[PDB]
CSV table of C-alpha atoms in Angstrom, one decimal:
chain,number,residue,atom,x,y,z
K,1,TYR,CA,-56.7,47.4,17.5
K,2,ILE,CA,-60.3,48.6,17.0
K,3,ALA,CA,-61.5,48.9,13.4
K,4,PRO,CA,-63.8,51.8,12.5
K,5,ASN,CA,-67.6,51.4,12.2
K,6,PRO,CA,-68.6,49.7,8.9
K,7,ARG,CA,-71.6,52.0,8.4
K,8,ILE,CA,-69.4,55.0,7.9
K,9,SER,CA,-68.6,54.5,4.2
K,10,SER,CA,-71.8,52.9,2.9
K,11,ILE,CA,-75.4,54.0,3.5
K,12,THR,CA,-78.3,51.6,2.7
K,13,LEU,CA,-81.6,53.1,1.5
K,14,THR,CA,-83.5,50.1,0.1
K,15,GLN,CA,-82.6,46.4,-0.5
K,16,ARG,CA,-81.1,47.0,-3.9
K,17,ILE,CA,-79.9,50.6,-3.6
K,18,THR,CA,-76.8,51.2,-1.4
K,19,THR,CA,-74.1,53.8,-1.5
K,20,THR,CA,-70.7,52.8,-3.0
K,21,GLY,CA,-67.4,53.7,-1.3
K,22,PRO,CA,-64.4,55.3,-3.1
K,23,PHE,CA,-61.7,52.9,-1.7
K,24,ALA,CA,-63.9,49.8,-1.9
K,25,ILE,CA,-61.1,47.6,-3.4
K,26,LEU,CA,-58.9,48.4,-0.4
K,27,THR,CA,-61.3,48.1,2.6
K,28,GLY,CA,-62.0,44.5,1.7
K,29,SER,CA,-58.4,43.5,2.0
K,30,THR,CA,-57.1,41.3,4.8
K,31,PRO,CA,-53.5,41.9,5.7
K,32,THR,CA,-50.8,39.2,5.6
K,33,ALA,CA,-48.8,38.2,8.6
K,34,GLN,CA,-45.9,40.4,7.3
K,35,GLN,CA,-47.9,43.5,6.6
K,36,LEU,CA,-49.6,43.2,10.0
K,37,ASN,CA,-46.1,43.2,11.5
K,38,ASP,CA,-45.5,46.5,9.8
K,39,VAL,CA,-48.7,48.1,11.3
K,40,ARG,CA,-47.3,47.4,14.7
K,41,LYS,CA,-44.1,49.3,13.8
K,42,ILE,CA,-46.2,52.4,13.0
K,43,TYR,CA,-47.9,52.6,16.3
K,44,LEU,CA,-44.6,51.8,18.0
K,45,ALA,CA,-43.3,54.8,16.1
K,46,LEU,CA,-46.2,57.0,17.3
K,47,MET,CA,-45.9,56.3,21.0
K,48,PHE,CA,-42.2,57.2,20.9
K,49,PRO,CA,-42.0,60.5,18.9
K,50,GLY,CA,-38.3,61.1,18.4
D,1,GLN,CA,-63.5,51.9,35.8
D,2,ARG,CA,-62.5,54.9,33.6
D,3,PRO,CA,-64.9,57.5,32.2
D,4,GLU,CA,-63.1,57.8,28.9
D,5,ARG,CA,-64.1,54.3,27.6
D,6,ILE,CA,-67.9,54.9,27.7
D,7,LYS,CA,-69.3,54.4,24.2
D,8,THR,CA,-72.6,56.2,24.1
D,9,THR,CA,-73.4,56.2,20.3
D,10,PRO,CA,-72.1,53.4,18.1
D,11,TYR,CA,-69.5,55.4,16.1
D,12,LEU,CA,-66.4,54.1,17.8
D,13,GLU,CA,-67.9,50.7,18.4
D,14,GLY,CA,-66.0,48.6,15.8
D,15,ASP,CA,-64.6,45.1,15.7
D,16,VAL,CA,-61.5,43.8,17.5
D,17,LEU,CA,-58.9,43.0,14.9
D,18,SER,CA,-55.7,42.1,16.8
D,19,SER,CA,-54.4,42.2,20.4
D,20,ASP,CA,-51.1,43.9,21.4
D,21,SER,CA,-49.3,43.8,24.7
D,22,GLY,CA,-46.3,45.2,26.6
D,23,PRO,CA,-43.9,42.2,26.7
D,24,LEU,CA,-45.0,41.3,23.2
D,25,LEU,CA,-43.7,44.5,21.7
D,26,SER,CA,-40.6,44.3,23.9
D,27,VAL,CA,-39.4,41.0,22.3
D,28,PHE,CA,-40.7,42.3,19.0
D,29,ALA,CA,-38.7,45.6,19.0
D,30,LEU,CA,-35.5,43.7,19.5
D,31,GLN,CA,-36.5,41.1,16.9
D,32,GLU,CA,-36.6,43.9,14.3
D,33,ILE,CA,-33.3,45.6,14.9
D,34,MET,CA,-31.2,42.5,15.1
D,35,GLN,CA,-33.1,41.2,12.0
D,36,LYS,CA,-31.7,44.2,10.1
D,37,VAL,CA,-28.0,44.0,10.8
D,38,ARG,CA,-28.2,40.2,10.2
D,39,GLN,CA,-29.8,41.0,6.8
D,40,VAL,CA,-27.4,43.7,5.5
D,41,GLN,CA,-24.3,41.8,6.7
D,42,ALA,CA,-25.2,38.8,4.5
D,43,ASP,CA,-26.0,40.4,1.2
D,44,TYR,CA,-22.8,42.5,1.3
D,45,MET,CA,-19.1,41.8,1.9
Z,1,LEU,CA,-79.3,72.6,-0.3
Z,2,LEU,CA,-78.1,74.2,-3.5
Z,3,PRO,CA,-76.2,77.2,-2.1
Z,4,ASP,CA,-74.5,74.8,0.4
Z,5,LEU,CA,-73.5,72.6,-2.6
Z,6,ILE,CA,-71.9,75.4,-4.6
Z,7,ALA,CA,-70.1,77.2,-1.8
Z,8,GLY,CA,-68.6,74.7,0.6
Z,9,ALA,CA,-69.3,71.1,1.5
Z,10,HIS,CA,-68.7,71.3,5.2
Z,11,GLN,CA,-71.3,73.2,7.3
Z,12,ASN,CA,-74.4,71.2,6.3
Z,13,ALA,CA,-75.3,67.5,5.8
Z,14,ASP,CA,-74.1,66.4,2.4
Z,15,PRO,CA,-76.6,64.8,0.0
Z,16,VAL,CA,-76.4,61.1,-0.7
Z,17,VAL,CA,-74.5,60.5,-4.0
Z,18,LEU,CA,-75.5,57.5,-6.1
Z,19,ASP,CA,-73.7,55.9,-9.1
Z,20,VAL,CA,-75.4,55.2,-12.4
Z,21,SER,CA,-74.1,54.1,-15.8
Z,22,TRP,CA,-73.9,55.9,-19.1
Z,23,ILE,CA,-76.3,53.6,-20.9
Z,24,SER,CA,-78.9,53.7,-18.1
Z,25,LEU,CA,-79.5,57.3,-19.0
Z,26,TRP,CA,-81.1,56.0,-22.2
Z,27,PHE,CA,-83.1,53.2,-20.4
Z,28,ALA,CA,-84.5,55.9,-18.1
Z,29,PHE,CA,-85.9,57.9,-21.0
Z,30,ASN,CA,-87.9,54.9,-22.1
Z,31,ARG,CA,-89.3,53.6,-18.8
Z,32,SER,CA,-92.0,55.5,-17.0
Z,33,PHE,CA,-93.0,54.7,-13.4
Z,34,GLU,CA,-96.5,53.6,-12.6
Z,35,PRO,CA,-97.0,53.1,-8.8
Z,36,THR,CA,-99.5,50.2,-8.7
Z,37,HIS,CA,-99.2,49.1,-5.1
Z,38,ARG,CA,-99.0,51.9,-2.6
Z,39,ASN,CA,-97.0,51.3,0.5
Z,40,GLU,CA,-99.0,49.5,3.2
Z,41,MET,CA,-97.4,51.5,6.0
Z,42,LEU,CA,-99.1,54.8,4.9
Z,43,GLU,CA,-102.2,54.7,7.1
Z,44,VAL,CA,-100.0,53.6,10.1
Z,45,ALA,CA,-97.6,56.5,9.5
Z,46,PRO,CA,-99.4,59.2,11.6
Z,47,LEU,CA,-99.4,56.9,14.6
Z,48,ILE,CA,-95.8,55.7,14.1
Z,49,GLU,CA,-94.6,59.3,13.9
Z,50,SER,CA,-96.4,60.1,17.1
Z,51,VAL,CA,-94.9,57.4,19.2
Z,52,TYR,CA,-91.4,58.2,18.1
Z,53,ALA,CA,-92.0,61.9,18.6
Z,54,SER,CA,-93.3,61.3,22.1
Z,55,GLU,CA,-90.6,59.0,23.3
Z,56,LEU,CA,-88.0,61.6,22.3
Z,57,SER,CA,-89.9,64.0,24.5
Z,58,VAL,CA,-89.7,61.8,27.6
Z,59,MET,CA,-85.9,61.5,27.1
Z,60,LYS,CA,-85.7,65.3,27.0
Z,61,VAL,CA,-87.4,65.7,30.3
Z,62,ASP,CA,-85.3,62.9,31.8
Z,63,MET,CA,-82.1,64.7,30.7
Z,64,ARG,CA,-83.2,68.1,32.1
Z,65,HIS,CA,-83.5,66.9,35.7
Z,66,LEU,CA,-80.7,64.4,35.8
Z,67,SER,CA,-78.1,67.0,34.7
Z,68,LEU,CA,-78.8,69.0,37.9
Z,69,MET,CA,-77.6,66.3,40.3
Z,70,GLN,CA,-73.8,67.1,40.5
Z,71,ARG,CA,-74.5,70.6,41.6
Z,72,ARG,CA,-77.1,69.4,44.2
Z,73,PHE,CA,-75.1,66.5,45.7
Z,74,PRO,CA,-71.4,67.0,45.0
Z,75,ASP,CA,-70.3,64.7,47.8
Z,76,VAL,CA,-71.8,61.6,46.1
Z,77,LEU,CA,-70.7,62.7,42.6
Z,78,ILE,CA,-67.1,63.8,42.6
Z,79,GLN,CA,-66.3,61.7,39.5
Z,80,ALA,CA,-69.6,61.7,37.6
Z,81,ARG,CA,-69.2,62.9,34.1
Z,82,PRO,CA,-71.8,64.2,31.6
Z,83,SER,CA,-71.6,60.8,29.8
Z,84,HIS,CA,-72.9,59.0,32.9
Z,85,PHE,CA,-76.5,60.1,33.1
Z,86,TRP,CA,-76.6,59.8,29.3
Z,87,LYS,CA,-75.8,56.2,29.8
Z,88,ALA,CA,-78.5,55.8,32.4
Z,89,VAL,CA,-81.3,57.2,30.2
Z,90,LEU,CA,-80.4,55.0,27.3
Z,91,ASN,CA,-80.5,51.9,29.5
Z,92,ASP,CA,-84.2,52.6,30.2
Z,93,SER,CA,-85.5,54.0,26.9
Z,94,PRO,CA,-87.3,51.7,24.5
Z,95,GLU,CA,-85.1,49.7,22.1
Z,96,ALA,CA,-86.8,50.9,19.0
Z,97,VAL,CA,-86.4,54.6,19.7
Z,98,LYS,CA,-82.7,54.2,20.3
Z,99,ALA,CA,-82.5,52.2,17.1
Z,100,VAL,CA,-84.0,55.0,15.0
Z,101,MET,CA,-81.4,57.5,16.2
Z,102,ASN,CA,-78.6,55.1,15.4
Z,103,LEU,CA,-79.2,55.1,11.7
Z,104,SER,CA,-77.1,58.3,11.6
Z,105,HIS,CA,-75.4,58.2,15.0
Z,106,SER,CA,-73.4,55.3,13.7
Z,107,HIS,CA,-72.8,57.3,10.6
Z,108,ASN,CA,-72.1,60.7,12.1
Z,109,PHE,CA,-70.2,61.3,15.3
Z,110,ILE,CA,-71.7,63.6,18.0
Z,111,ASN,CA,-70.1,64.4,21.3
Z,112,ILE,CA,-71.4,65.6,24.7
Z,113,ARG,CA,-71.8,69.3,23.6
Z,114,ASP,CA,-74.3,68.2,20.8
Z,115,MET,CA,-76.7,66.3,23.0
Z,116,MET,CA,-76.9,68.9,25.7
Z,117,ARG,CA,-77.9,71.4,23.0
Z,118,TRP,CA,-80.7,69.1,21.9
Z,119,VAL,CA,-82.0,68.7,25.5
Z,120,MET,CA,-82.4,72.5,26.1
Z,121,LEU,CA,-84.3,73.2,22.9
Z,122,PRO,CA,-87.9,74.3,23.6
Z,123,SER,CA,-90.0,71.7,21.7
Z,124,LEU,CA,-92.0,69.0,23.5
Z,125,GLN,CA,-94.7,66.7,22.1
Z,126,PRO,CA,-97.4,66.4,24.7
Z,127,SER,CA,-98.9,62.9,25.2
Z,128,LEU,CA,-100.2,60.9,28.2
Z,129,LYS,CA,-96.8,59.5,29.3
Z,130,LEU,CA,-95.0,62.9,28.9
Z,131,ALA,CA,-97.5,64.9,30.9
Z,132,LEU,CA,-97.2,62.5,33.8
Z,133,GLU,CA,-93.3,62.4,33.6
Z,134,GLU,CA,-93.1,66.1,34.0
Z,135,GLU,CA,-95.1,65.9,37.3
Z,136,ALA,CA,-93.2,62.8,38.6
Z,137,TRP,CA,-89.9,64.7,38.5
Z,138,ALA,CA,-91.6,67.7,40.1
Z,139,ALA,CA,-93.1,65.6,42.9
Z,140,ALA,CA,-89.7,64.0,43.5
Z,141,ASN,CA,-87.8,67.3,43.7
Z,142,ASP,CA,-87.2,67.0,47.5
Z,143,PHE,CA,-85.2,63.8,47.8
Z,144,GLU,CA,-86.5,63.4,51.4
Z,145,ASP,CA,-89.7,62.1,49.7
Z,146,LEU,CA,-87.5,59.5,48.0
Z,147,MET,CA,-86.5,58.3,51.5
Z,148,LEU,CA,-82.8,59.1,51.6
Z,149,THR,CA,-81.0,61.9,53.4
Z,150,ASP,CA,-77.6,62.9,55.0
A,1,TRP,CA,-48.2,72.6,10.7
A,2,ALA,CA,-49.8,75.4,12.7
A,3,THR,CA,-50.0,73.3,15.9
A,4,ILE,CA,-47.9,73.5,19.1
A,5,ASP,CA,-47.5,69.8,19.6
A,6,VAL,CA,-45.0,70.0,22.5
A,7,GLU,CA,-45.9,71.9,25.7
A,8,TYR,CA,-44.8,72.0,29.3
A,9,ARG,CA,-47.5,72.2,32.0
A,10,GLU,CA,-46.4,71.0,35.5
A,11,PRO,CA,-43.4,69.7,37.3
A,12,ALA,CA,-43.3,66.0,36.5
A,13,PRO,CA,-42.6,63.3,39.1
A,14,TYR,CA,-39.5,62.5,37.0
A,15,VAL,CA,-37.2,65.6,36.9
A,16,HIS,CA,-35.9,64.9,33.4
A,17,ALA,CA,-39.1,64.5,31.2
A,18,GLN,CA,-41.1,67.7,31.7
A,19,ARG,CA,-42.9,67.6,28.3
A,20,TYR,CA,-46.4,66.6,27.1
A,21,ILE,CA,-46.8,65.2,23.7
A,22,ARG,CA,-50.0,66.5,22.0
A,23,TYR,CA,-50.4,65.2,18.4
A,24,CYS,CA,-52.4,67.7,16.3
A,25,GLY,CA,-52.8,70.1,19.3
A,26,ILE,CA,-55.4,67.9,21.0
A,27,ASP,CA,-55.7,67.5,24.8
A,28,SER,CA,-56.9,64.2,26.3
A,29,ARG,CA,-59.8,66.1,28.0
A,30,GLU,CA,-61.7,66.1,24.7
A,31,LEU,CA,-62.7,62.5,25.2
A,32,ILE,CA,-64.3,63.5,28.4
A,33,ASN,CA,-64.9,67.3,28.5
A,34,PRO,CA,-65.4,68.4,24.9
A,35,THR,CA,-64.8,71.9,23.5
A,36,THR,CA,-66.6,71.9,20.0
A,37,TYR,CA,-69.5,70.2,18.4
A,38,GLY,CA,-69.5,67.0,16.3
A,39,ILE,CA,-68.9,68.9,13.0
A,40,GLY,CA,-66.2,71.3,14.0
A,41,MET,CA,-63.6,68.7,15.2
A,42,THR,CA,-60.7,69.8,12.9
A,43,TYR,CA,-57.2,71.0,12.8
A,44,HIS,CA,-55.2,73.1,10.3
A,45,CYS,CA,-52.9,70.2,9.1
A,46,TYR,CA,-55.9,68.1,8.0
A,47,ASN,CA,-58.3,70.8,6.8
A,48,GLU,CA,-56.0,71.9,4.0
A,49,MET,CA,-55.8,68.4,2.7
A,50,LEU,CA,-59.6,68.3,2.2
A,51,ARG,CA,-59.9,71.7,0.4
A,52,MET,CA,-57.2,70.5,-2.0
A,53,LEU,CA,-58.8,67.2,-3.0
A,54,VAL,CA,-62.0,69.2,-3.6
A,55,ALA,CA,-60.0,71.6,-5.8
A,56,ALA,CA,-58.4,68.8,-7.9
A,57,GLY,CA,-61.7,67.1,-8.6
A,58,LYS,CA,-61.4,64.2,-6.1
A,59,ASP,CA,-64.5,65.2,-4.2
A,60,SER,CA,-65.7,61.7,-3.7
A,61,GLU,CA,-62.4,60.9,-2.0
A,62,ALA,CA,-62.6,64.1,0.0
A,63,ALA,CA,-66.0,63.1,1.5
A,64,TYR,CA,-64.5,59.8,2.7
A,65,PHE,CA,-61.7,61.5,4.6
A,66,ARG,CA,-64.1,64.1,6.0
A,67,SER,CA,-66.2,61.3,7.5
A,68,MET,CA,-63.2,59.5,9.1
A,69,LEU,CA,-62.1,62.7,10.7
A,70,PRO,CA,-63.8,62.3,14.1
A,71,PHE,CA,-62.4,58.8,14.3
A,72,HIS,CA,-59.0,60.3,13.5
A,73,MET,CA,-59.0,62.8,16.3
A,74,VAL,CA,-60.2,60.3,18.9
A,75,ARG,CA,-57.2,58.0,18.0
A,76,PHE,CA,-54.7,60.8,18.6
A,77,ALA,CA,-56.6,61.6,21.9
A,78,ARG,CA,-55.5,58.2,23.1
A,79,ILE,CA,-51.9,58.1,21.9
A,80,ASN,CA,-51.5,61.3,23.9
A,81,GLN,CA,-53.1,59.4,26.8
A,82,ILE,CA,-50.5,56.7,26.4
A,83,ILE,CA,-47.3,58.7,26.0
A,84,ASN,CA,-47.5,61.3,28.7
A,85,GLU,CA,-49.6,59.3,31.2
A,86,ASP,CA,-48.3,55.7,31.0
A,87,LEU,CA,-44.9,55.7,29.3
A,88,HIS,CA,-43.5,58.0,31.9
A,89,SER,CA,-40.5,56.3,33.7
A,90,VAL,CA,-36.8,56.8,34.1
A,91,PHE,CA,-36.3,55.2,30.7
A,92,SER,CA,-38.1,58.0,28.9
A,93,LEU,CA,-35.9,60.4,27.0
A,94,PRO,CA,-34.8,63.6,28.8
A,95,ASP,CA,-35.8,67.0,27.3
A,96,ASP,CA,-32.2,68.2,26.6
A,97,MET,CA,-31.9,65.3,24.2
A,98,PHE,CA,-35.4,65.6,22.9
A,99,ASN,CA,-34.7,69.2,21.6
A,100,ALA,CA,-31.6,68.0,19.8
L,1,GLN,CA,-115.0,57.0,12.2
L,2,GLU,CA,-116.8,53.8,13.0
L,3,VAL,CA,-115.8,53.9,16.7
L,4,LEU,CA,-117.4,57.3,17.5
L,5,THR,CA,-120.9,56.3,16.2
L,6,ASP,CA,-123.1,53.8,17.9
L,7,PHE,CA,-126.3,54.0,19.9
L,8,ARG,CA,-124.4,54.4,23.2
L,9,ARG,CA,-122.0,57.3,22.1
L,10,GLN,CA,-123.8,59.7,24.4
L,11,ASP,CA,-122.5,58.4,27.8
L,12,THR,CA,-118.9,57.6,26.9
L,13,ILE,CA,-115.5,58.8,28.0
L,14,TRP,CA,-112.7,58.7,25.4
L,15,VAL,CA,-109.3,58.1,27.0
L,16,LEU,CA,-107.1,58.8,23.9
L,17,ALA,CA,-103.4,58.9,24.9
L,18,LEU,CA,-101.6,60.3,21.8
L,19,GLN,CA,-102.3,63.7,20.2
L,20,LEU,CA,-102.3,63.7,16.4
L,21,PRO,CA,-100.8,67.0,15.2
L,22,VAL,CA,-97.2,66.0,15.5
L,23,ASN,CA,-94.9,68.9,16.2
L,24,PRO,CA,-92.3,68.3,13.4
L,25,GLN,CA,-89.7,70.3,15.2
L,26,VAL,CA,-89.2,67.6,17.8
L,27,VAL,CA,-88.2,65.1,15.1
L,28,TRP,CA,-85.9,67.6,13.4
L,29,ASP,CA,-84.1,68.5,16.6
L,30,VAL,CA,-82.1,65.2,16.9
L,31,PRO,CA,-78.6,66.3,16.2
L,32,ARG,CA,-77.2,65.4,12.7
L,33,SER,CA,-80.3,63.4,11.9
L,34,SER,CA,-80.7,64.1,8.2
L,35,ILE,CA,-79.8,60.7,6.9
L,36,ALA,CA,-81.9,59.0,9.7
L,37,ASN,CA,-85.1,60.8,8.6
L,38,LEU,CA,-84.5,60.0,5.0
L,39,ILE,CA,-84.3,56.2,5.5
L,40,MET,CA,-87.3,56.4,7.8
L,41,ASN,CA,-89.2,58.2,5.0
L,42,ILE,CA,-88.4,55.7,2.2
L,43,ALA,CA,-89.5,52.7,4.3
L,44,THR,CA,-92.7,54.4,5.4
L,45,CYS,CA,-94.0,56.1,2.3
L,46,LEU,CA,-92.3,55.0,-1.0
L,47,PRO,CA,-94.6,53.1,-3.3
L,48,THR,CA,-94.0,50.1,-5.4
L,49,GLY,CA,-94.6,49.9,-9.1
L,50,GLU,CA,-93.8,48.7,-12.6
T,1,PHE,CA,-88.6,45.8,-0.6
T,2,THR,CA,-87.3,47.6,2.4
T,3,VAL,CA,-84.3,46.4,4.3
T,4,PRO,CA,-85.1,44.1,7.3
T,5,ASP,CA,-83.2,46.4,9.7
T,6,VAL,CA,-85.8,49.1,9.3
T,7,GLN,CA,-88.7,46.7,9.1
T,8,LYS,CA,-87.9,45.5,12.6
T,9,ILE,CA,-87.8,49.0,14.0
T,10,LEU,CA,-91.3,49.7,12.6
T,11,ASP,CA,-92.9,46.6,14.1
T,12,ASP,CA,-91.8,47.8,17.6
T,13,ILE,CA,-93.1,51.4,17.3
T,14,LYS,CA,-96.5,49.7,16.5
T,15,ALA,CA,-96.3,47.6,19.7
T,16,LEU,CA,-95.2,50.6,21.7
T,17,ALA,CA,-98.4,52.3,20.7
T,18,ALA,CA,-100.5,49.6,22.4
T,19,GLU,CA,-98.4,49.7,25.6
T,20,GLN,CA,-101.0,50.8,28.2
T,21,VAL,CA,-99.8,53.1,31.0
T,22,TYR,CA,-102.7,53.5,33.4
T,23,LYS,CA,-105.2,51.1,35.0
T,24,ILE,CA,-108.9,51.5,35.7
T,25,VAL,CA,-109.8,50.5,39.2
T,26,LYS,CA,-112.9,50.7,41.4
T,27,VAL,CA,-111.3,51.6,44.8
T,28,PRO,CA,-107.9,53.4,45.0
T,29,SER,CA,-104.8,51.9,46.6
T,30,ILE,CA,-104.6,52.1,50.3
T,31,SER,CA,-102.7,55.0,51.7
T,32,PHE,CA,-103.0,54.8,55.5
T,33,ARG,CA,-102.8,51.9,58.0
T,34,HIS,CA,-103.2,52.0,61.7
T,35,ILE,CA,-101.2,50.0,64.2
T,36,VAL,CA,-102.7,49.1,67.6
T,37,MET,CA,-100.4,49.6,70.6
T,38,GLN,CA,-102.3,47.9,73.4
T,39,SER,CA,-104.5,50.9,74.2
T,40,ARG,CA,-108.2,51.8,73.9
T,41,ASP,CA,-107.8,55.5,72.9
T,42,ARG,CA,-104.5,56.1,71.1
T,43,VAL,CA,-103.2,54.2,68.0
């Protein structure tokens, strides 16, 4: 499961001046071992449509 | 070996979060259906 | 930049949006900006701009001749894709000139139909290494002179 | 929404699954042989969601979903490459049950 | 221009390898390079002050 | 106060400007050699 590129949401101009993302409180969240078992159910529901 | 996995520019080059396999999801798909009828047959008469 | 802000946010590059506070509007009215130390890369900027604009030109002549190989030798290349000679030029280009393009190539996705538009555009910066590269490809047009044949 | 996401192209090696799943009307050639530029990778189901969040005042959240859009279309160009190219056996569902 | 003036500037051959008027079209032809030129402009020309 | 990812890619464009391409020689490189073949007239 490849994560997207980290330089998509935030651009860095100088040392102290960076862009801030909208969903910043959610990108920095590590899933639990139960929620990661629910991500596998979604891609198992996408490879088998009906 | 395949020409569809050639990353030219680093847009799709992200990290590797978790690995998933064929026989892993086979035992996992059966461990999610049988863990549902064993759950709704214990909370209810 | 202003009519592509009012009308619709798609068809041009969006401006970089920064986030300030309410009270820092008042602390900007009472702080002027006095540039004491000028940046010490100013007098090196016309030379840095000329190396980067010259190495982009050698990559443009390298893509123009390599893209005409599948039509010339279709028996060697039955499975060569337009992403393949792209991968061969970048594995020979300097590391700095790749790492200037990747400040936005990692931020903005471009596919094969975008780079082969940039290659055909008629704008070259002549230097010493470009004006020899245009004759090296012209001298190696007949591949018998590269000592290989069928 | 306005996308033909199920089509029939060729006689399959299995005579019961003649269909090709194409999420968001995207063929798996667009990883290799592209059609449009880097900007104009879009579809009708996704583009209306962006011109609504702009309308309701959530323009900072629209610009996040506009930048993850080429990462979105590449993902569905691999799920299509898994369904109708790898998960094609006897145990796939036949088409007379897929339409019901 | 210290280098072009000495007592032996008559019999010299200058072998300059980079032309100075940079064609600015060949920098602005890199596709979707509008954020890449901005960050290269801040690091090369922005001053520092109080 | 620039970020050290752009500071590194300015200290290599400087070094690429000092990368010399040619070389100044007295005699050119050799371009023809002759092989003797145990004869006095034909090589």
